[PDB]
Point group: D2
Chain length 260, copies 4
């Protein structure tokens, strides 16, 4: 249990982000959701955290692709909570294309949100944790923060940056009661991944599941998706006392991806 | 959280092997403890696991150093417990000496108990788990499973084998509900380490706790030992449903050892 | 040798840059130097590359902190060399400070040159090399692209990001005859580092060379500095055919830095 | 380049091991080959190297599965060579089978040879190198020393042990002018390999080249085998004054295998 704890998750209005915000809350921590999305959904989910888990759940808007905006975003966050014990850096965007064909504009946005946002966020959370004697910076990289895949230059670089950045955060606060780790996800049955599945399904005349296993075969040996409840659990674990000595390292939930 | 689960931990009569069993027993699993010791203390440690967590605890002596003996051993445990859900391959010894001064005896022993016992124990338990459709193989490796240190050729080579072996186990059972991961601890305050702290405390004319920091300084930036309770905790988490898609990788509780 | 190859090198008017150019040139390839400097020395350096090794040497200026600048740069490089086989991204800058006190000017300035210049520079050379059928992109990363250190969030983030980009580049051009590898150096006795030999020298009362070892002890087990020439050799190595199938990997010359 | 050097390669009467003894010879170093085969075949090769490179070649028959035997083998190698500057541990064996079926004979035979031999061979060559003030230990592992594949437990374990063993050896001798790295090749068109490629060839009716790209496509992106000569060029480069500061690291030649 993380009762009494004050958690903050960026880009947490749906999918991965919203999943961890859910499990942290379910674990007893007060949270702060963030990210763009159809407003009613935002409020509806923010409300559903409060009621279903009996904790405080605030919503603070912020376009993390902006250095300063994100730095103040956490300050407000901490004020809304009356503290800041756990910070989950999730915000992210993607784009597929060969290097020679990769839009410089695209390259900057991914680096800015995927990499930069993590730095500015930590930079602002640390002082509050250092002064408390306890903290947890959990960055959400991916298996791509450990290995690469065709045409994902920007994303892989950024993710590899986050892993490194995770290691300096850990060393700079070693022994101060603060740890920093990165959860490196594998495939997740995400809405648009769900569209990729349908595409291969009706394009080959196969059931949805067979189509699913088809998309997972090149990378996830388990051929089974990593579930949001599992990602949430990983985060809740890192935040556990048992993870007091775990720091600067990665936690891979990729159903076997990197093992080979 | 692991109520009704049957777990077997090798080298569980004290130290880390004892805490992990205790932690799983606290999670509800029945546990089979194994290791050397004065029968009065074994019966004591076994007796409390039982009276304290209301689970069933059985002790099975076995020479993990012999391929055959370790196989009938798991076969015996499966039987005692009435099944086998979680196997923690813990046992192991250490010998420090330069490469060109390393006793072939010590070399062969380190490898037989630290590496081979893992394989024989994995192979004997795997069928039970494969027929059930669910399993948890947890190898207790080390930071030295990922990196080296002067004068530990046998231990480092053995520990790396475990990490390699753990990857093959996970890929061979991908999607079968059987996962294999390797926990990689850093400095752990063992009884032999206490004397080492004691000796350095008097040598440098400084206090005991100041000597602990001094000892961990070169390898563990957190200047804090990973507790046994913490590794049992990591074991529990690995045995959880939140880790169904965490297979063939490493859990590093090393205070930052491998971040630098 | 590499007779007739057309290698380009960023940040090469001095330091490792010039070194690699010298080795690539020493092996008979036509080079192109690029970097800040006094028109005398630079020319004196180019001109000498032309006489000293019997090859063609060109100089090109460019603000690699600018996409278009760096993209227009390798273009000029080619036009001058009449092709382009070996590309080397070396440029980079440093800045030490705890994450929470790291100026955003420095983080952005480091990410843009150390990491973003790699992207763009690569994206402009690939087409050239793609139509040719042979490529060789060498990215000078750092021990800090695999592990971290205190107060180096940006430089470590950027160098990890280059490792990833290296893999993606290699994977994206698999079997095409183009390979991309990242050389990861340990400490190089740079006049900058020399200022650290001396402070440590005057502070502890030890002779200059004993202080050289005291500086390296913390990270480089061989207590010996990596030399600019050695790196140059490694560059020529990756440019040879023996390395035809080494792609997307790291070549560490760190005296055991990453080994422990 | 290696004129006057004394190098030894185990298991080099043919294949990969031979390519290296050959390239080292071409480098100018005298060499000691070893392995299996007919007296007429061995002599034929020992013959050529010597008479086709202006180098002295000696052949020693030693069973490297026996601890005391391999320790005698290098003793005799330095005797016949007049010193020992380069030791290339290459002798290995394989066996494919699921873990619960993997033959204990097989496991012990793989470990003794693929791993234990590398230990003993290194322990006996070091003293000679320690006294010399210069030395080169080049272990030949594989991508299975970094990652894994299904059904190759003993091999992937032993290989991982080597890599770990390679690190210790380097840290134990860093600065002494001696280095130890591990060459990690990917698919090589080896005898044992070739039949897998002809197996699937007539198992789908496709000519080799296609049934082979099958075997490749799963792990090796560049769809091109690693040639023995290339591996030789690598050992030659690891023996150069360029890699004097390259030690305890792995050098991967695997068409992008570990890149993704
Ligand atoms: Ca991999
Ligand atoms: Ca390390
Ligand atoms: Cl890919
Ligand atoms: Cl050490
Ligand atoms: Cl550090
Ligand atoms: Cl496989």
């Amino acid at each position: 249990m993380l009762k009494g704890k004050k958690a903050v998750v960026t880009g947490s209005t749906s999918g991965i982000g919203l999943a961890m915000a859910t499990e942290l809350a379910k674990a007893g921590a007060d949270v702060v959701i963030n990210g763009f999305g159809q407003p009613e959904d935002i409020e509806r989910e923010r409300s559903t955290l409060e009621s279903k888990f009996g904790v405080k759940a605030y919503y603070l808007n912020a376009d993390l692709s902006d250095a300063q905006a994100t730095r103040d975003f956490i300050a407000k966050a901490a004020e809304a909570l009356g503290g800041l014990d756990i910070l989950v850096n999730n915000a992210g965007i993607q784009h597929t294309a060969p290097i020679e064909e990769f839009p410089v504009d695209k390259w900057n946005a991914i680096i800015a949100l995927n990499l930069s946002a993590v730095f500015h966020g930590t930079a602002a959370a640390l002082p509050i944790m250092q002064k408390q004697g306890w903290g947890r910076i959990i960055n959400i990289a991916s298996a791509h923060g450990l290995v690469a895949s065709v045409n994902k230059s920007a994303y892989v670089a950024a993710k590899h940056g986050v892993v490194g950045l995770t290691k300096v955060t850990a060393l700079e606060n070693a022994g101060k009661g603060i740890t920093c780790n990165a959860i490196c996800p594998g495939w997740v049955r995400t809405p648009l991944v769900e569209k990729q599945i349908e595409a291969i399904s009706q394009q080959k005349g196969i059931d949805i599941e067979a189509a699913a296993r088809e998309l997972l075969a090149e990378k996830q040996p388990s051929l089974q998706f990593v579930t949001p409840e599992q990602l949430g659990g990983a985060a809740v674990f890192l935040s556990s006392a048992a993870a007091d000595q775990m720091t600067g390292t990665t936690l891979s939930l990729d159903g076997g991806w990197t093992a080979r």
